[PDB]
Design a protein around this nucleic acid. Structure first.
Ligand SMILES: [Mg+2]
Ligand SMILES: [Mg+2]
Ligand SMILES: [Mg+2]
Ligand SMILES: [Mg+2]
Ligand SMILES: [Mg+2]
Ligand SMILES: [Mg+2]
Ligand SMILES: [Mg+2]
Ligand SMILES: [Mg+2]
Ligand SMILES: [Mg+2]
Ligand SMILES: [Mg+2]
Ligand SMILES: [Mg+2]
Ligand SMILES: [Mg+2]
Ligand SMILES: [Mg+2]
Ligand SMILES: [Mg+2]
Ligand SMILES: [Mg+2]
Ligand SMILES: [Mg+2]
Ligand SMILES: [Mg+2]
Ligand SMILES: [Mg+2]
Ligand SMILES: [Mg+2]
Ligand SMILES: [Mg+2]
Ligand SMILES: [Mg+2]
Ligand SMILES: [Mg+2]
Ligand SMILES: [Mg+2]
Ligand SMILES: [Mg+2]
Ligand SMILES: [Mg+2]
Ligand SMILES: [Mg+2]
Ligand SMILES: [Mg+2]
Ligand SMILES: [Mg+2]
Ligand SMILES: [Mg+2]
Ligand SMILES: [Mg+2]
Ligand SMILES: [Mg+2]
Ligand SMILES: [Mg+2]
Ligand SMILES: [Zn+2]
Lengths: 159, 187, 103, 52
RNA sequence: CUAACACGUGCGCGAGUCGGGGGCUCGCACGAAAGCCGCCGUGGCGCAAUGAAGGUGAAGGCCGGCG
RNA sequence: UAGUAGCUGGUUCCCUCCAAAGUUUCCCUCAGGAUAGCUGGCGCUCUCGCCCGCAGUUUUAUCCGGUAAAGCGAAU
RNA sequence: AGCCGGGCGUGGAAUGCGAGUGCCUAGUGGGCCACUUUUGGUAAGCAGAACUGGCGCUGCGGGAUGAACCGAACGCCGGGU
RNA sequence: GGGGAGUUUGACUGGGGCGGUACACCUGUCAAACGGUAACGCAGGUGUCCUAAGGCGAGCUCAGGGAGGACAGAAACCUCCCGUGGAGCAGAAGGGCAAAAGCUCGCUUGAUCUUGAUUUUCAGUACGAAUACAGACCGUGAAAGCGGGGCCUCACGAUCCUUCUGACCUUUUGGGUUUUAAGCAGGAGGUGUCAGAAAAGUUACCACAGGGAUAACUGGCUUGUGGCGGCCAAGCGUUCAUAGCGACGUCGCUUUUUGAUCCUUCGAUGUCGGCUCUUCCUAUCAUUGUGAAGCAGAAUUCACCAAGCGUUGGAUUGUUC
RNA sequence: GUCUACGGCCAUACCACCCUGAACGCGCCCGAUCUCGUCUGAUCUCGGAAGCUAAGCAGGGUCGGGCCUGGUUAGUACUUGGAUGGGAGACCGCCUGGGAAUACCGGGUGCUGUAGGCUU
């Protein structure tokens, strides 16, 4: 059977990208994580302290505790037929703010603003994101040039 | 052929009391009629609770009843409980209450009558208030039974304050291996 | 491994870091009147032969050796047990090694 | 074998308990006999206290 | 089938509950039943837990009197 | 002494409803058990005749990867 | 960071559907087959895995025959397709 | 003190046994781009080592190469230049690392005391290992800081018993003092079959409950091996590739050899040969009819239709051969 | 236009050679009493201001290497789902969707934050 080591099969997952080894850029250290941010997990092999287990690599969780160097986050893990929301502590290098939430936040601010506006105007405005509707009817103008014929080319071997 | 599942097709709720006595069944007849020919849902709740079993109709204590009726806004309303009103001895001052219950302890009934309240039974309650206006529907603590201390997450498992099943309490009964860091492990 | 004979470390009684004299802990002589021993001879006496098991399948060639620490402060002189990882050869404060010499 | 959850029990029926069983089917007859003896002694000691 | 335990259900009473052992009932067809005891509740279970043990043992919140 | 048997054989009426597993971990464990998983029964708390949630699905965003392919005039 | 008090309902993608929760619990813990992926093997109706569906637990029309293939899953009947 | 008694004599497992450990662990792959994922699959490693190879701080830069300098050279030491790591970091492998995680010095013992939480296998239980904290005592540095072992992934052990350490600790039972003993908490002494019995064989004198979950026949699938047959045409055949052969290749057929497997049979299908007797196949030895020869005749080759009819008597061996 | 101090993103910023640098600045540079450290004031530390853009540094150049970004390769390779499709097989075609990577050919060669200067 296999081995139950903590880092089995991570030679590519925890490795560094090509031509990106060396000193960790300081912007990663200079970011602020508060209680309740949605955050992504991406193990970085450069630092070995507080490295998350390989099964949380690429997972997104919620911050619930902030500490000197690390952050505690609640993340869902599918174990057999059930999902457990378990909390793990990850050092700040292996973490990154999720941009999936800021889009929704900006949308909230923007449609709240356009709801506050036009409230006095009384006009109607659409807020829900409708799915891509079918294309409407239109005209395709030929400019006096007729469409050119397309025919299959004859078979002839290359190799 | 239809792509459906029949596991949860049949609902398990009670249609009628499992009991066989005749007085409760007469009450059930009356409240069945009331529930189906009145739009008030108090009758529906009362009939449903009449259907229930003994362990689902826990007794309500006098202290609980006075505590829940002393709350603001609910003065001079009738306290309705489908269970048994038992006396509480650790309460001296008892006000006058208008109680309705299936059965009341003798000492509790004496206490209420001495205090000046009146005891009602669900029949006379129907006559007084068919739709049940001015009623405070109470119930005893359902989780009061001691069997619930044995339920839930199993003992000998981290962060589980569940009572084990032990034939006798003492220092020689389930205290050594799973309960101490000194002997094996501590959960 | 090599361990020095003196170590400045925490002392429980003093509640502060103090110098400690360290030695190697060796098992004491088994008292004949321990409860377990007394029960053992009471059970073994008579007929029926051997009762408790005798271990034979030895497997480990080493053992964790324990350092006995003693606070050098004459008033305190408290003692504590400290153990570290297994080792085949072990010595106390011998031939402090130096680098870059003739092999 | 243990089931899911329950109490560990130590029934003391590992001997030949079925040979030494004390049924109490003579309890009413014993009570009747003790009574009869009681009244017989009470009659025997004519004016003396029955209790003793 | 007996005993033990767990849980679910039905009934009585309910911070209590239970005579199973004994006794009183002119012993005796049924009746070896049934009724009663209450200063026969000894006692069991419950009402308090925790600690190895010595042991300890289950709210407090506002104003006037020397922020 | 009706000795024990994780092993063979047998295990008695009808209809109705629901309906599996041969997988995880531990065991002198491998023809067996315990434990999760899968099943049934008993319920209970609410709900509609504005709104709550949920989904073996899609959409819109946003991250995660080193297989198929490809490369050796790029590292090994 | 926690507290209070106050104001905002166009319920902020599509589709579908009542949901949550608690006890007690039997049987099972020999599996097999197929498209695709795949390891050992010259290979096998061989041995070993992943996903899904089946057989086992399942009858029916077709493949003459048939545990698994194709269609389709079942109360007792009449008509139609 | 096998005269006699009681008992034991692991598991896995292409039958069992011998072999091996796939039995507790770790790296890469298998593994199908989350995770997980099998086989006695593949390549390997572990039961240690370290007073520093732990912890800080400072200063330097490695492997290799080129050009120079008395002995001196291919290689001894010095200097300059190039040098993205091609070196080193204890060990297997993988990841990671350049004013460092490497090399050299300075000072030290965070490898110390203590309560909780979390991750890894997972049942989401332990052990082991690890991660963030928090509370004291410290080390180092000017300091920010860093450090409660080794850059990360592995290097280890329940109950019962014994032993040591701790408190002006509790009990030692009618009261008191002192020895003793028992407790409470933390380490150590094991169980490598590594969630942990105290354990040698033989039976052809054997027994029981079972098993076609499993071997020894046949029969099935397979056809490597055996047997037989093709295509190509290097060469042999004095000359001439193909009268007759045919190298180096390559495609098949058969189940009269052996393997491989374990589907049927273990509440039994009588398990080698020979004797006797019948029938069938053709991949034809002879005979009938043919065609080709390196066929003058004779003899003998190769091929075709073809199984109608024949295919013996003996020595040796249980033999089949 | 540009520099210095501290930086962010870390080659569009690197590497090789060549040309030009007004002012400030950054440097090279001059010495070792003190602070400090070496075999050596070479480095480090300290005290200065005779000279110089020679070098570093900045800007620019190269049908430059590299790097970054496009086209081609290419709807090719591969691939989700489907068929009582083909083929003895090996494999291949089609339907429904997604869709690469070399060679080869183009373009570009650091943006920018805070504070403080020079261009009087
Ligand atoms: Mg139907
Ligand atoms: Mg059901
Ligand atoms: Mg003796
Ligand atoms: Mg069972
Ligand atoms: Mg049970
Ligand atoms: Mg029997
Ligand atoms: Mg068995
Ligand atoms: Mg069987
Ligand atoms: Mg891979
Ligand atoms: Mg490939
Ligand atoms: Mg198979
Ligand atoms: Mg089914
Ligand atoms: Mg079917
Ligand atoms: Mg057919
Ligand atoms: Mg029809
Ligand atoms: Mg013997
Ligand atoms: Mg995958
Ligand atoms: Mg350094
Ligand atoms: Mg600390
Ligand atoms: Mg180190
Ligand atoms: Mg013999
Ligand atoms: Mg078989
Ligand atoms: Mg020739
Ligand atoms: Mg026969
Ligand atoms: Mg026979
Ligand atoms: Mg022929
Ligand atoms: Mg100088
Ligand atoms: Mg210059
Ligand atoms: Mg110049
Ligand atoms: Mg170029
Ligand atoms: Mg700037
Ligand atoms: Mg001017
Ligand atoms: Zn001390």
């Amino acid at each position: 059977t296999n081995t139950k080591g903590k880092r089995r099969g991570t030679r590519y997952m925890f490795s560094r990208p090509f031509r990106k080894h060396g000193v960790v850029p300081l912007a990663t250290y200079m970011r602020i994580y508060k209680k309740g941010d949605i955050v992504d997990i991406k193990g970085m092999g450069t630092v070995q302290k507080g490295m998350p287990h390989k099964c949380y690599h690429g997972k997104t969780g919620r911050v619930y505790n902030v500490t000197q160097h690390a952050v505690g986050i609640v993340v869902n893990k599918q174990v057999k037929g059930k999902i457990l929301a378990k909390r793990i502590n990850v050092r700040i290098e292996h973490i990154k703010h999720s941009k999936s939430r800021d889009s929704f936040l900006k949308r909230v601010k923007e449609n709240d603003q356009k709801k506050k506006e036009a409230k006095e105007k009384g006009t109607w405005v659409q807020l829900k994101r409708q799915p891509a509707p079918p294309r409407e009817a239109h005209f395709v103008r030929t400019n006096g040039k007729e469409p050119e014929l397309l025919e299959p080319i004859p078979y002839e071997f290359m190799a | 052929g239809v792509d459906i599942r029949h596991n949860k097709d049949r609902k398990v709720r009670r249609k009628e009391p499992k009991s066989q006595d005749i007085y409760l069944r007469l009450l059930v007849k009356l409240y069945r009629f009331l529930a189906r020919r009145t739009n008030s849902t108090f009758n529906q709740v009362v009939l449903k609770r009449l259907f229930m079993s003994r362990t689902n109709r826990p007794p309500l204590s006098l202290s609980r009843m006075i505590r829940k009726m002393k709350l603001p806004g609910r003065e001079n309303k009738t306290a309705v409980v489908v269970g048994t009103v038992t006396d509480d001895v650790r309460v001296q001052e008892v006000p006058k209450l208008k109680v309705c219950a299936l059965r009341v302890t003798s000492r509790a009934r004496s206490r209420i009558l001495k205090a000046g309240g009146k005891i009602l039974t669900f029949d006379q309650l129907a006559l007084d208030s068919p739709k049940g206006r001015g009623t405070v529907l109470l119930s005893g603590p359902r989780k009061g039974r001691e069997v619930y201390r044995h339920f839930g997450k199993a003992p000998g498992t981290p962060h589980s304050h569940t009572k084990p099943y032990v034939r006798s309490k003492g220092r020689k009964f389930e205290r050594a291996r799973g309960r101490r860091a000194s002997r094996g492990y501590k959960n | 491994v090599n361990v020095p004979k003196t170590r400045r470390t925490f002392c429980k009684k003093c509640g502060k870091h103090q110098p400690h004299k360290v030695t190697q802990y060796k098992k004491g002589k088994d008292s004949l009147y321990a409860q377990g021993k007394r029960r053992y001879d009471r059970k073994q006496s008579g007929y029926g032969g051997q009762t408790k098991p005798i271990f034979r399948k030895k497997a480990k060639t080493t053992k964790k050796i324990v350092l006995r620490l003693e606070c050098v402060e004459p008033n305190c002189r408290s003692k504590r047990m400290l153990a570290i990882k297994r080792c085949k050869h072990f010595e106390l404060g011998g031939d402090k090694k130096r680098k870059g010499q003739v092999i | 074998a243990p089931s899911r959850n329950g109490m560990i029990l130590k029934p003391h029926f590992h001997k030949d308990w079925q040979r030494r069983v004390a049924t109490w089917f003579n309890q009413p007859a014993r009570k009747i006999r003790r009574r009869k003896a009681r009244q017989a002694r009470a009659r025997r000691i004519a004016p003396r206290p029955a209790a003793g």
